[PDB]
């Protein structure tokens, strides 16, 4: 199993007005820690992608959905909204259906027209209202996003809760850890911090 | 196993169990066999379903006539307070099938005790070849399992619902789903032995029935 | 998973549960697995369902008439057969329900499968009209939420009817809310340590 | 897991991590891998953790009737080889430390194979590699015992930063002629950026 | 094969080992496992014996001509962009390239060394210091206490030199030295006397 | 499953039981087995090859005119060879049975019988098949034989689907397990 | 094969004055519930719960052997209360006797140690055994533990304003408090595990004896 | 091989092929499967079992008197469980057939069919069979049988061997393929 | 493991390596894989890594008890055959020893020196010089060449040397230099400057 | 199998040893191991005879080919790469010796997984131990022709008595910058007395 190889955790969550996505920092080789910056969430225009799994796979799809989103804003004229960007998504998954990317994606945004957040997850598209977890930790993620998450949450109390989510199933897991980052993200701003946790 | 026999379906109502499987003894495809009784009373009070390896049930039925002369033996009460309970005849079998599974010579069955205690509670607990043991309001084997046990849940879903079912509701029942089992299951049969345990009026032993 | 189709007397009705599962895990409790083909075709499986329905509406286009369940049985078929469903629908032709090939009065897949075909059995019966079909289709559905754990959640409908729009009832039954927590798990603002904050220009 | 003993001029400084992990799935932070054999002998387990702790148990045993018979404490040369002996007839990596008045300060590596190796320095596990380096770089015989605890505890926390299946805390030991003496807990979480702090090393991560 | 890689204030020293053996018998102690993509980008590789080279050659022989093409040098960055989209394309193919390789670099136009580590797979990263495979199992506690980004060059053939006296002390086999690289503003030299 | 054909003094009759089964599962217990592919040919499997042959049937219907049994088989056989049983009325052939085992040659036969119930049959139905036999002595036969087929066969079981391919036109008829099961 | 697996997950507790162990009542085979209340955790005497989780059959027999145990304990030492620590190796002295055949169980038992503090213990399988503050077992525990580090031990949690300098500081639960995280956390692991639900039976251990509190959990 | 027994009113009668193959090859085309194990016991498989068997019933015979059918399927269990057709008459069972499938189970039938050739005669000897057949009612009944057993099954042939156990005493039948085959 | 046996005109001289592997680390560097048998008789062993030591020290002991028994010592010969009997059984048994000994003894009777190589199946045999493994494909040629009977034991010292540095050389291992013994009249002393 | 090529002052010598073994049957004593590719370029064979024979053969066609193009002899490098190519793009062991204006006496080996290394001593086969050791102690570069003829002899003599597989006899060939010379074939069994009777060697062999 190539998604194991990496190791890494993506967490999304939606709040009042707001979506927070969250990842930890981790690159590994095995159990061999390689690198502590290899940030696992991208952005393109005001949609946020968290790509877990293997690394060099994450590193592909990134750079196929950098390609496929400038061609749609040229061809277009707007930005990609994470509806679409979501069926996009589904989409370049499947057209690998049996030569597949070993990654599992986690789509974060607010539309630009409706402002309602939206996060979705993955190609059967998993368009959750609460929260979507991926990677080595999605069980500890479940438990902890299941136990701590309520509704309606503000930005900071949304990034408190993302966090401790995001540290906890990062704690119990052995591939993931090595630092985190998480973005609050509101139509207006987009704020990002690192969070300090155990270095083991 | 080479001969095996199909579902055990048993379920508790406010006054005592009911158990019922057919007697067939399938070969393969091969409808072989169509007179075996797999429903083995123990006493007055304990009836024995057996599923699975004939010929380890077979074993087992001799197993049981066995315990039933050793504890006549040197027993003025052996037809009375002292008699064979269900959790004694329950747990006897359990051990054995445990301690077979744990010489890597398993009895390939699967058997349902069913029955009433002395103070008149009901049992009804199941045992494998692995030695899995586990009691439920219903219970069933095999293809029962999935198909027969959804309809007895219907009826009786938890423990408290055991006291609002009656006898007459509990072998309708019983009877629906040997006819469901007969329509989807491509081992079973026409016939069937329906044994019924009840605290006061005792067990009640019917052969023969016709889906 | 668990999926039944039930034809009666003046249409077919599908039904599934809500629950996807990625091993012991469930992943979506809310998936909707009643996939719409045309607006009165219907799939449930236990991508290849969003290009059949493309063809099918193209196709539809094409002769300017009404896409029928054979058509889209027909595409199915040759398309998997080249690398398991319920397809259910009306068309002029009337109300179908097949499996993938069987046709069936009524069907069951799934995880769930052996519950559901155990209530159907139990009572189904011939020329059930629309509310008695739903009622049998549900209960189905419900018998194998309560006793295969692969199944879970909600029940969703659709039914087709030979002269109505098709209805599909999302989440027609929802017999699995959680009960409220028994503490709030709100964290006081400051809780987490942070290393470095940064404000993104999207 | 990281199991580290080396001697020095104050005895044997044994260090260990904590962690037990069921997969990637971390089950226990807060695992004892040293076993407290008698007052004067420890064993450290890395794998086969249940044959280590019955086996040093029983050798504590041993140990016991071996005093009673002969009014004298076995000799860590026994123990091992009665641990070597055990382990080769039901053919894990582990270190048995003593400081006897005969031998002096003394550590034996037992592993799974049969093999029973005295030295100096010891170290088992996933982590050994970072651990091994630290000790390589960094151990002398004249270390002091603070600094020794130090080394140990530095070990540990190369080999639980870089490894994923080390971490946890830190368990520091240090076996004396008068017996070993516990000599805590450490959260490598918390001894992390301490050292990072104080030493200035793991440049590479932000703080 | 052993490669290191440690990046400095002003350059990127890169290490490889000289051991090259099939079966059973070192055929030859003096290998160089590095190939100049560019006059200010080195890259170094590691791993199946005969990908290696073919690979390595690939990429010289696509980064020469770019350069030519355009009259002017890919950055390291871009590079190593190239190189791990190789890489990528391979570990999908009929037969995958299994190469590891460190690519360092001077960017001329940022005044600024990288290195850049590449596995097989294609995990591209940009480190302050690399090591493939096993290597840095024995490396990477050193470098994780002394290195500094402030390093000169000195100081970071000095880290280098304990890395590979660690090397030889614990790994168990003889890949009979290294050859030492450095890469700056000034070009690409080997360091001889390591 | 449990498939039989019987040429007649007035053409050939395609009889089947309709049980399906995954294992010791009745998945479908109404199936229709008996499989159009042209007009007055019918066959009948021990589902895609069917589609190709009525497609490639059609195509020579409309070339070439009506196609015989015998073109239906060879080109059952093209597809297979590059267990069915083919049977079929034609004026001239007054009904014919063609066989198909699972490797891939073709036989003509005055009856066939194939399945898992088949076997348990084999010995009866020498016995009791004789040729020129009446519809009304041909459908007892079929019945007989395909009643002691399910009886012994754990995958054979339900309604004897019957097709009755004459001059006269087809002919569908339905046994339900309480009339043939008291034969 | 003679082994399986019948789901079920535990969860032991150790409180300052307290014990509890509590675990999911539901027995499953494959996809299949065999019975919705069939309970794994069991009061073995002397304020000692025991639970051993995995393979039923050798989970039976185990938690059958121990209870054998003690009672030859009781018959040897005049009725004397069984210590949890001598429960402990008693335990691991039942696991290794089938070393090579092992009892395919991770086993929890709680109690209160002699100076009358909370007490956990888990087993391995092949025998070894640790004295914890808490312990999860079977398949939903890492759906349920990384909650209750983050809830009891206050796991990466600071104190605010402290610039995450100050850890949030350990606190003395009740035995209601700890409660209501067990039941939250099973609630939890109800929702996202196919395995847990049908009721939650909770064993509690304090100086006044064992009680048992039950909760339902959903039947999904 | 195929093998059956059959209880009639005034006892029972085992018969038997008498082919033994080695895949293709008719090693022994004039084998005697019919096997004694007691004066009016018999057993036939579908070998050293049999001798334990007889060494047991011997045994049993000078100490306990002379068995019966049933003690000699015991027998045959408690060796077989820790494909067999055991026939034989005593004075009061008046003849009974007793059958052990590979399994291990013993069933007590009015009569028995096994082995290969038994699959084919399913359905033949069902339809056929009848309670308190005539001897040579059941002579005839067996010949039908095994003979479409013969005809079907390739490891079945030679002579058909017959064993009448009654009363009377026990009597030996052959029927070669010139006879039997022509029914 | 690597083990050499010369004899020479007065005396035997084994070497063995010093390292000690398990996994990815060399644990030991300075091992001895050799048990001192009686006075005049030494053995080398090598081969798996539990059995060694252990069959030595069970061959050490049952030479010693002999000793005691019969307050006499056994011939070289005679402590041949005897481990080879013991390897012939475990061969057979229901774990052998993957053991491969070097016996170098002198016979204080006939006063002639003695080596036996005798491997893990039991195939005893006395030669001039000898190894075990793969050690030989990198000796024999020299002693092929360089040996005589009349060798004085500096020259075999020379010769072993020789044979030494070829193995660094071409070995792709790394068994970290050899420990040097001498069997004579006069008992067993060891080379510790070679 | 023992195939050797060694670079001197006086160019190549390549010498093989002549044995092909069918299982423990020996085929032959006579298999030539050396392809005159072309009047200037060797090829040896060590495994994989016939894909070696057949691409040498063609790499000689390429050879002339480029000759006739560019007026000009390929080069070792150029036919190793050749070579090298081929092998790699249908991924034995070869040794492409030649002695050009340019790049001087020149040993390119080539194996079976893709590698190309440029040196002055290989040796492939069976037997490349013992061979290689002969060299190593006996290899000059300021080595005359005639002994470094005799060592090329005496290092296949080496591994033809001690590897089972190699024997036969000698094929001695010297590359000079006119083109090589064939120096003979030399029976392993009249060499190997010879050499002991000249040399004092093979004291254990009693002759």
């Given at each position: 199993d190539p998604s194991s190889i990496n190791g890494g955790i993506v967490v999304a969550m939606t709040g009042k007005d707001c979506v927070a996505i969250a990842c930890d920092l981790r690159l590994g080789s095995q159990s061999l820690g390689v690198s502590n910056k290899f940030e696992k969430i991208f952005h393109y225009g005001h949609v946020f992608?968290?790509?877990?799994?293997?690394?060099?796979?994450?590193?592909?799809?990134?750079?196929?959905?950098?390609?496929?989103?400038?061609?749609?804003?040229?061809?277009?004229?707007?930005?990609?909204?994470?509806?679409?960007?979501?069926?996009?998504?589904?989409?370049?998954?499947?057209?690998?259906?049996?030569?597949?990317?070993?990654?599992?994606?986690?789509?974060?945004?607010?539309?630009?027209?409706?402002?309602?957040?939206?996060?979705?997850?993955?190609?059967?598209?998993?368009?959750?209202?609460?929260?979507?977890?991926?990677?080595?930790?999605?069980?500890?993620?479940?438990?902890?996003?299941?136990?701590?998450?309520?509704?309606?949450?503000?930005?900071?109390?949304?990034?408190e809760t993302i966090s401790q989510a995001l540290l906890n199933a990062a704690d119990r897991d052995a591939l993931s850890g090595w630092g985190a980052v998480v973005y609050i993200i509101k139509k207006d701003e987009v704020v990002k911090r690192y969070l300090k946790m155990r270095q083991d | 196993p080479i001969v095996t026999g199909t579902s055990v379906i048993s379920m508790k109502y406010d006054n005592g169990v009911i158990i019922a499987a057919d007697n067939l003894g399938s070969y393969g495809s091969l409808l072989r066999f169509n007179g075996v009784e797999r429903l083995i009373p123990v006493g007055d009070n304990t009836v024995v379903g057996i599923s699975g390896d004939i010929s380890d049930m077979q074993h087992i039925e001799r197993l049981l006539k066995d315990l039933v002369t050793e504890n006549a033996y040197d027993n003025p009460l052996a037809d009375a307070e002292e008699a064979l309970e269900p959790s004694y005849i329950f747990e006897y079998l359990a051990?054995?099938?445990?301690?077979?599974?744990?010489?890597?010579?398993?009895?390939?069955?699967?058997?349902?005790?069913?029955?009433?205690?002395?103070?008149?509670?009901?049992?009804?607990?199941?045992?494998?070849?692995?030695?899995?043991?586990?009691?439920?309001?219903?219970?069933?084997?095999?293809?029962?399992?999935?198909?027969?046990?959804?309809?007895?849940?219907?009826?009786?879903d938890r423990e408290s619902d055991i006291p609002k079912t009656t006898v007459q509701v509990a072998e309708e029942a019983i009877v629906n789903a040997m006819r469901v089992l007969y329509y989807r299951d491509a081992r079973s049969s026409r016939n069937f032995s329906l044994a019924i345990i009840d605290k006061n009026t005792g067990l009640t032993f019917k052969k023969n029935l016709q889906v | 998973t668990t999926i039944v189709g039930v034809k009666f007397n003046n249409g077919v009705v599908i039904a599934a549960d809500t629950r996807s599962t990625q091993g012991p895990i469930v992943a979506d409790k809310n998936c909707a697995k009643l996939h719409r083909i045309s607006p009165k075709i219907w799939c449930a499986g236990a991508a290849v369902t969003q290009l059949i329905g493309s063809n099918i509406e193209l196709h539809s286009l094409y002769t300017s008439r009404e896409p029928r369940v054979v058509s889209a049985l027909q595409m199915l078929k040759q398309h998997l057969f080249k690398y398991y469903l319920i397809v259910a629908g009306v068309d002029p032709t009337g109300s179908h329900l097949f499996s993938i090939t069987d046709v069936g009065y009524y069907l069951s897949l799934g995880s769930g499968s052996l519950a559901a075909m155990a209530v159907l059995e139990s009572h189904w019966k011939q020329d059930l009209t629309k509310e008695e079909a739903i009622k049998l289709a549900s209960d189905a559905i419900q018998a194998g939420i309560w006793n295969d754990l692969g199944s879970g959640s909600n029940v969703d409908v659709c039914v087709m009817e030979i002269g109505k729009d098709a209805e599909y009832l999302r989440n027609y039954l929802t017999p699995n809310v959680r009960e409220e927590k028994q503490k709030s798990y709100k964290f006081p603002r400051g809780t987490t340590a942070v290393l470095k904050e940064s404000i993104v220009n999207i | 897991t990281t199991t580290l003993a080396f001697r020095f001029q104050g005895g044997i400084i044994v260090a260990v991590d904590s962690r037990a992990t069921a997969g990637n799935w971390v089950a226990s932070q807060t695992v004892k891998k040293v076993i407290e054999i008698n007052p004067f002998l420890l064993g450290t387990m890395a794998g086969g953790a249940a044959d280590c702790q019955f086996w040093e148990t029983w050798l504590g045993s041993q140990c016991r009737l071996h005093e009673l018979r002969e009014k004298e404490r076995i000799s860590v040369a026994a123990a091992s080889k009665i641990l070597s002996n055990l382990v080769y007839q039901y053919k894990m990596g582990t270190m048995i430390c003593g400081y006897t008045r005969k031998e002096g300060p003394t550590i034996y590596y037992v592993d799974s194979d049969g093999t029973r190796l005295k030295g100096d320095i010891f170290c088992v596990g996933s982590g050994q590699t970072f651990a091994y380096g630290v000790l390589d770089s960094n151990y002398k015989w004249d270390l002091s015992v603070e600094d020794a605890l130090y080394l140990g505890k530095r070990s540990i926390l190369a080999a639980a930063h870089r490894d994923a299946y080390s971490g946890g805390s830190v368990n520091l030991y240090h076996v004396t002629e008068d017996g070993w003496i516990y000599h805590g807990n450490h959260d490598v979480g918390e001894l992390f950026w301490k050292v990072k702090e104080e030493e200035g090393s793991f440049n590479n991560v932000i703080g | 094969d052993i490669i290191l890689g440690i990046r400095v204030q002003d350059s990127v020293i890169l290490a490889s080992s000289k051991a090259v053996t099939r079966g059973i018998s070192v055929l030859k102690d003096s290998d160089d496992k590095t190939r100049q993509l560019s006059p200010h980008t080195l890259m170094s590789f590691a791993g199946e014996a005969g990908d290696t080279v073919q690979f390595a050659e690939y990429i010289q022989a696509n980064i020469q001509l770019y350069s030519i093409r355009e009259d002017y040098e890919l950055s390291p960055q871009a590079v190593s962009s190239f190189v791990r989209q190789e890489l990528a394309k391979s570990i999908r193919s009929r037969r995958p390239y299994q190469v590891n390789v460190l690519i360092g670099g001077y960017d001329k136009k940022k005044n600024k060394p990288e290195l850049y580590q590449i596995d097989y797979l294609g995990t591209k990263v940009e480190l302050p210091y690399g090591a493939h495979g096993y290597s840095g199992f024995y490396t990477f506690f050193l470098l994780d206490h002394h290195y500094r980004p402030d390093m000169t060059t000195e100081e970071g053939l000095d880290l280098l030199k304990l890395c590979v006296q660690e090397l030889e002390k614990r790994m168990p086999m003889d890949f009979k030295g290294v050859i030492v690289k450095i890469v700056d503003k000034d070009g690409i030299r080997q360091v001889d006397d390591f | 499953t449990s498939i039989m054909a019987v040429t007649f003094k007035d053409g050939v009759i395609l009889g089947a039981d309709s049980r399906t089964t995954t294992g010791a599962y009745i998945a479908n217990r109404v199936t229709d087995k008996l499989t159009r592919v042209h007009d007055k040919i019918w066959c009948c499997r021990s589902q895609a090859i069917a589609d190709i042959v009525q497609y490639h049937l059609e195509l020579y219907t409309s070339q070439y005119g009506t196609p015989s049994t015998e073109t239906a088989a060879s080109v059952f056989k093209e597809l297979c060879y590059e267990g069915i049983i083919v049977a079929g009325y034609d004026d001239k052939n007054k009904g014919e049975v063609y066989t198909i085992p699972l490797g891939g040659s073709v036989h003509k036969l005055p009856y066939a019988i194939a399945g898992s119930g088949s076997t348990f049959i084999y010995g009866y139905c020498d016995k009791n098949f004789r040729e020129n036999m009446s519809k009304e002595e041909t459908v007892d036969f079929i019945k007989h034989s395909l009643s002691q087929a399910i009886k012994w066969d754990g995958s054979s079981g339900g309604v004897i689907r019957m097709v009755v391919l004459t001059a006269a036109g087809v002919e569908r008829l339905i046994f339900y397990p309480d009339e043939y099961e008291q034969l | 094969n003679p082994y399986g697996d019948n789901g079920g997950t535990i969860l032991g507790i150790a409180g300052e004055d307290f014990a509890v162990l509590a675990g999911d009542t539901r027995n499953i085979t494959d996809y299949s519930?065999?019975?919705?209340?069939?309970?794994?955790?069991?009061?073995?005497?002397?304020?000692?719960?025991?639970?051993?989780?995995?393979?039923?059959?050798?989970?039976?027999?185990?938690?059958?052997?121990?209870?054998?145990?003690?009672?030859?304990?009781?018959?040897?030492?005049?009725?004397?209360?069984?210590?949890?620590?001598?429960?402990?190796?008693?335990?691991?002295?039942?696991?290794?006797?089938?070393?090579?055949?092992?009892?395919?169980?991770?086993?929890?038992?709680?109690?209160?140690?002699?100076?009358?503090?909370?007490?956990?213990?888990?087993?391995?399988?092949?025998?070894?055994?640790?004295?914890?503050?808490?312990?999860?077992?079977?398949?939903?525990?890492?759906?349920?533990?990384?909650?209750?580090?983050?809830?009891?031990?206050?796991?990466?949690?600071?104190?605010?304003?402290?610039?995450?300098?100050?850890?949030?500081?350990?606190?003395?639960?009740?035995?209601?408090?700890?409660?209501?995280?067990?039941?939250?956390?099973?609630?939890?692991?109800?929702?996202?595990?196919?395995?847990?639900?049908?009721?939650?039976?909770?064993?509690?251990v304090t100086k006044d004896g064992v009680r048992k509190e039950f909760y339902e959990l959903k039947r999904d």
């Open positions: 992608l968290g790509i877990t799994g293997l690394a060099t796979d994450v590193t592909t799809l990134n750079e196929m959905f950098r390609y496929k989103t400038n061609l749609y804003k040229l061809k277009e004229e707007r930005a990609i909204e994470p509806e679409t960007f979501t069926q996009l998504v589904s989409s370049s998954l499947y057209e690998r259906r049996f030569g597949p990317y070993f990654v599992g994606p986690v789509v974060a945004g607010i539309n630009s027209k409706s402002g309602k957040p939206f996060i979705a997850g993955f190609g059967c598209i998993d368009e959750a209202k609460d929260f979507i977890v991926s990677g080595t930790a999605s069980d500890q993620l479940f438990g902890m996003c299941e136990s701590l998450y309520e509704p309606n949450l503000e930005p900071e109390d949304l990034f | 051990t054995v099938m445990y301690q077979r599974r744990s010489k890597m010579n398993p009895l390939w069955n699967a058997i349902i005790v069913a029955g009433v205690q002395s103070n008149g509670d009901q049992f009804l607990r199941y045992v494998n070849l692995l030695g899995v043991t586990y009691s439920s309001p219903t219970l069933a084997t095999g293809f029962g399992a999935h198909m027969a046990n959804p309809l007895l849940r219907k009826v009786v | - | - | - | - | 519930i065999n019975s919705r209340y069939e309970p794994k955790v069991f009061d073995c005497g002397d304020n000692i719960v025991m639970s051993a989780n995995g393979f039923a059959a050798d989970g039976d027999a185990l938690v059958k052997r121990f209870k054998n145990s003690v009672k030859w304990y009781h018959f040897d030492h005049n009725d004397k209360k069984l210590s949890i620590n001598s429960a402990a190796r008693n335990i691991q002295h039942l696991l290794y006797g089938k070393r090579f055949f092992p009892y395919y169980v991770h086993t929890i038992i709680a109690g209160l140690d002699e100076d009358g503090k909370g007490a956990v213990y888990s087993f391995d399988p092949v025998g070894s055994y640790e004295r914890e503050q808490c312990r999860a077992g079977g398949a939903a525990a890492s759906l349920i533990m990384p909650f209750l580090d983050n809830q009891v031990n206050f796991k990466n949690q600071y104190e605010p304003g402290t610039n995450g300098k100050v850890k949030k500081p350990l606190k003395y639960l009740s035995v209601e408090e700890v409660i209501k995280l067990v039941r939250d956390s099973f609630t939890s692991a109800t929702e996202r595990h196919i395995q847990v639900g049908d009721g939650l039976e909770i064993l509690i």
